[PDB]
Design a protein around this ligand. Sequence first.
Ligand SMILES: O=C(O)c1ccc(-c2oc3c(Br)cc(Br)cc3c(=O)c2O)cc1
Ligand SMILES: [Cl-]
Ligand SMILES: [Cl-]
Ligand SMILES: [Cl-]
Length: 334
Amino acid sequence: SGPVPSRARVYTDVNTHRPREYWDYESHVVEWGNQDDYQLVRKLGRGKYSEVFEAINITNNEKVVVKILKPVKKKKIKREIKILENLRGGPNIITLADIVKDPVSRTPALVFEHVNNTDFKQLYQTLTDYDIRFYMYEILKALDYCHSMGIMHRDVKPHNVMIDHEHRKLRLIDWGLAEFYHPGQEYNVRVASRYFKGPELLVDYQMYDYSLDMWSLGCMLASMIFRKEPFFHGHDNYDQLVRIAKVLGTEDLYDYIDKYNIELDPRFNDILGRHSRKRWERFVHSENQHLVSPEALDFLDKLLRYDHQSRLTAREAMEHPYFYTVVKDQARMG
Ligand SMILES: O=C(O)c1ccc(-c2oc3c(Br)cc(Br)cc3c(=O)c2O)cc1
Ligand SMILES: [Cl-]
Ligand SMILES: [Cl-]
Ligand SMILES: [Cl-]
């Protein structure tokens, strides 16, 4: 009888209550700036980021960052720009300063604010227990904000989290896969990187929502406190679900599948087989001991749920005891 419909628990009708021009990016007329205002200085990313440059705005001598976009469809260009513009000014969202196009090649490029970067993938050797809690909370600020603005990021991972550890600042970047949430809409499941894909993507359930981002966040958290990168290390798309199943157990997976009347490939059921749930305690060793706590484990348990509707919202997450002291400390110092 086909899959059972699903709706976001929160922020369900955000885009519905806003004017059409807010979310209808296909009708958005892009107002391009002048590329001549910007001169490229050098390459950024140290070999991990393509077509990202430090640049200078010669109209005010301000240092900026330029990302040159890969040849995708015009529709996806409008989408990213529209979303960045709608989210501009939000807490811990990267700030789009301008958009330009090359005179002759007509190659589009985004101009961002300049922020220092100690790569999140290279920062776990000097990251204490409090540090992980702090930065996780900052990520949640961004996710709660964009969700409340009717937007799913759909590509949450360490690579897309820029961290300036000196000033303890954080920015969520690369909104190229982001989309607007509309209740009842079916979305493409070919999003996110394999290690951070939620179960809904891996079983081809298209009517997902903001909670997708919360799974990805759980994967990041698991990786950092257990010192295992990535935590769910699938070698292909089937193996990704298998390795999730080896931790969460197959019992809750099949219940999830039945709940939304999802139909898997016949061979997939044989592949998944039968696995018991591992207690989160079993991934703790003497070298990740100092990053693990009862509240950390409880928090992780409530993010990594098969059922996307059962996962904590960003706001629910921010009020979890895992952040109790972090919240108190931030509220009296800044
Ligand atoms: O939306 C994007 O795809 C997107 C990519 C890179 C930056 C981006 O990257 C930096 C890197 Br990589 C190194 C250093 Br140092 C600084 C930045 C920076 O300030 C900055 O905005 C921002 C946004
Ligand atoms: Cl989509
Ligand atoms: Cl694994
Ligand atoms: Cl949320």
